[PDB]
Amino acid sequence: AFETTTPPEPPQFPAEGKINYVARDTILEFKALPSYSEPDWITEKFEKAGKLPPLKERLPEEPLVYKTGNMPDGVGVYGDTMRHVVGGRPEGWNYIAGQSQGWGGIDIALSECLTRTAPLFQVDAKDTEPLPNLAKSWEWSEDGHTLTMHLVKGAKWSDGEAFNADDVMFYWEDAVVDPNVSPLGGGASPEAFGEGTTLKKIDDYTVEWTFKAAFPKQYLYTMAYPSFCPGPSHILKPQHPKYSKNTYNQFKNAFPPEYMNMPVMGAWVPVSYRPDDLIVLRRNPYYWKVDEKGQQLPYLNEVHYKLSTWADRDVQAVAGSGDFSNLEQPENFVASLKRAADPNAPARLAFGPRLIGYNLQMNFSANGWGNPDERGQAIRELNRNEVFRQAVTSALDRKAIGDSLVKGPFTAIYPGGISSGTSFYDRASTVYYPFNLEGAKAALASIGLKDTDGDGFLNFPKETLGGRNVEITLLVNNGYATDKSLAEGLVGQMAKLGLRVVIHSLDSNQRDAAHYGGQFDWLVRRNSTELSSVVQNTEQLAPVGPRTSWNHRSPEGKELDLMPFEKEMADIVRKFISSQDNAERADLMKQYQKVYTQNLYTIGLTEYPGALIVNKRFSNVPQGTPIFMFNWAEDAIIRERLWVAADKQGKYELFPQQLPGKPGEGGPINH
Ligand SMILES: OC[C@H]1O[C@H](O)[C@H](O)[C@@H](O)[C@H]1O
Ligand SMILES: [Ca+2]
Ligand SMILES: [Ca+2]
Ligand SMILES: [Ca+2]
Ligand SMILES: [Ca+2]
Ligand SMILES: [Ca+2]
Ligand SMILES: [Ca+2]
Ligand SMILES: [Ca+2]
Ligand SMILES: [Ca+2]
Ligand SMILES: [Ca+2]
Ligand SMILES: [Ca+2]
Ligand SMILES: [Ca+2]
Ligand SMILES: [Cl-]
Ligand SMILES: [Cl-]
Ligand SMILES: [Cl-]
Ligand SMILES: [Cl-]
Ligand SMILES: [Cl-]
Ligand SMILES: [Cl-]
Ligand SMILES: [Cl-]
Ligand SMILES: [Cl-]
Ligand SMILES: [Cl-]
Could you list which residues have their CB under 5 Å from ion ligand 20? Predict the structure, then answer.
């Protein structure tokens, strides 16, 4: 049919950054400390003035204590600002209803979860337990069906109202289970946590999970970001349609970006917003996290998120106006490395493994996901045909694809599936469909695709759509140059084949509704955590549930119209989730990858490494922190643990010695 081989070994990528590997519990623990500390102005300008309760009351009985042994530069000092530059825009503050805050670490810094996984890049193997975040501990029953979860006892929201099970329950019942509410990210569906999995309150600081499978420990990662982020239930519940006279759109848009001081479990709170300009966050006085010395975290008092572009984030970091960047667009690498070459540069650049991938995803729903018309339906039928996918992938010159982004040692031939940069990857297991355009052309002719009008474009058979020319719609993320470069390239190569492809370029917010809704034929997408880690959001590897897959979901309400490879892939993923055996887990992924790549669950375009860019003044930045693994580096670096020595501190605070106001008020509080 096609002469399949294994993908070629990429060029050697030296002068990277080595991770200092550590055991799971070297990072944090939950203990009551003898005495506690904070910035002197809080005690002298707020506590003594009345304005705030003493620190001891603001903190839980047992706070989250960061161990100093795991701190790269040791225990810190208070002061300075973290200046971010984002390419996104806020929709509002309702994360659990599916509103974007702008990305670039803004929703990571606000919405804290039951567990935490991003810092697990530094723990040895891939059978690691996620770190206890809002849930301090958990026990499994002798059978493996029940998880008793113990929450942090005594934590408060950034406004002062207690954090308890009512917030965890509100999210599970009124967002996850509730079919009308859709949490931000497109993957917090009920089955993400297992089919027929329930959750129930015991007491205010104890919740109980009930799983259909025995010890499906892989779900503790789904309890981390983005899928299990509780919101301020005392603010959200009176706006919720089950609890009020609000529609689901009224609830969704109940808190516009202008609405200030929204209650968070995160280290900073939004105090200022200026459309297309800036969002300013100030340290949360009710933060439940401290260091071994009793100092109430964070160290940095202020966070900025400049509303600009994704490319400008890179430009501004190497120049020194922005403090942080994930350099992920190969079109920026050369400019960034040139500025990095200067020894007097304000930022340090550090490349990691090839964990950034892009895949072509085809809509596999033939039972009407996204309500397709006759032309739409005809493409879903082509997409599900294995000979059409084999020809589409073989018409791709993958060497030229990589070279269209950046020439050199960065890119790797990527057929699809598991990222080559991850441990779970097996090269022998990956199926490579080499560049064979003439072969691809002949395969499309064999399924009934020939040019009928002599224009150079292929045609549907006489029986399909009146024998009209083939028309495919490609959904593209408008916020990235890479996505666009790839989208245009694919169109040019699909044109050489004969397939006519139309670019539908939408803004991030729009693109997600058109994708998660099913309103697409083909799409270009950057790979999420499951292809970069396997262990994080494993449910997205196959259609295990009716909404767990990026390219094969079913309409509400209907069962999946799965293909035999997808059915076998879902069996692999379900077995992997409930497996505690590492050798079984390693060969389950060798199996998974082979089924993926040979069947073409997605069609790989290219893969490459991103670099972490941080301003040199920042301390406690872990060595070898990837830009993307269990999550984005914003999460991985532990920003509440970052600090700056007082002789290095910048003068960038826009509300110095101020704290957040009340939810709904103007902004921050002084004087
Ligand atoms: O959420 C963090 C994440 O947001 C966007 O997707 C950016 O492109 C990423 O590099 C990273 O900043
Ligand atoms: Ca003082
Ligand atoms: Ca994104
Ligand atoms: Ca686990
Ligand atoms: Ca130049
Ligand atoms: Ca070289
Ligand atoms: Ca190829
Ligand atoms: Ca034609
Ligand atoms: Ca569905
Ligand atoms: Ca089967
Ligand atoms: Ca550092
Ligand atoms: Ca360091
Ligand atoms: Cl003491
Ligand atoms: Cl220690
Ligand atoms: Cl300070
Ligand atoms: Cl939160
Ligand atoms: Cl109301
Ligand atoms: Cl805006
Ligand atoms: Cl090279
Ligand atoms: Cl490895
Ligand atoms: Cl962080």
Answer: 423
Instruction: Determine the distance separating the centroid of ligand 12 and the alpha carbon of 38, expressed in angstroms.
Output: 24
224, 126, 5: which is closest to 532 by C-alpha?
126
Name the nearest CA neighbour of 85 among 252, 315, 256, 246. Answer: 315
Residue type, 481: A
Q: Which residue owns the Cα nearest ligand 1 atom 2? A: 104
Distance 591 CA to ligand 4 centre (A): 20
- The answer to whether the CB of 640 falls within 8 A of the CB of 28 is no
- Atom 9 of ligand 1 has which residue's CA nearest to it? 104
Q: Round to whole Å and give the CA distance between 291 and 485.
A: 45
> Which of 100, 103, 323, 613 should be mutated for ligand 1, with most atoms under 8 A from CB?
103
Q: And the tokens for 488?
A: 């245009």
Ligand 7 centre from 378 Cα, in Å? 25
Q: Tokens 């960038």 appear where?
A: 652
Which residues approach ligand 1 with their CB closer than 6 A? 103-105, 108, 310, 326, 328, 632, 634
| Determination approach | X-ray
Q: Whose CA is nearest to atom 11 of ligand 1?
A: 104
Query: Per the structure block, which two tokens stand in for 637?
Result: 């670096």
Residue to substitute in 101, 106, 326, 328 for testing ligand 1 pocket (most ligand atoms within 8 angstroms of CB): 326
What is the DSSP track for 468-524?
PBPEEEEEEETT-HHHHHHHHHHHHHHHHHT-EEEEEEE-HHHHHHHHHTT--SEEE
Report in angstroms the alpha-carbon separations of 307 from 85, 274, 550: 6, 9, 28
Helices (H), 342-385: 374-383
Find residue 283's DSSP bridge partners.
268
Which residues have a Cβ under 8 Å from the Cβ of 554 and sit 6 or more positions away? Answer: 365, 367, 369, 546, 547, 560, 561
Separation of 78 CA from ligand 15 center, angstroms? 5
Give the number of whichever ligand sits closest to the CA of residue 14: 6
User: Bridge partners of 450?
Assistant: 459
What resolution in angstroms, rounded to 1 decimal? 2.5
CA 494 – CA 501 distance, rounded (Å): 7
Beta strands in 317-441 (DSSP E): 324-327, 347-351, 356-362
CA of 588 to the centre of ligand 16 (A): 34
Tokens of 177: 């289970």
Spacing, Cα 51 to ligand 1 middle (Å): 36
Q: Ligand 20 mean position to 207 CA, how many Å?
A: 36
Ligand nearest the Cα atom of residue 324? 1
CB 211 within 8 A of CB 567: no
**How are beta strands 659-660 and 668-669 bridged, if at all?**
antiparallel
Radius of gyration, CA atoms only, the chain: 25
Q: In what order do the strands lie in the sheet with 198-203?
A: 135-140, 146-151, 206-210, 198-203
Helix axis angle for 310-319 and 333-341, nearest 10°, is 10
Comparing C-alpha atoms, which of 256, 298, 303, 262 is closest to residue 279? 303
Q: How far apart are CA 84 and CA 100, in angstroms?
A: 16
**CA separation for the pair 60, 153 (Å, rounded):** 6
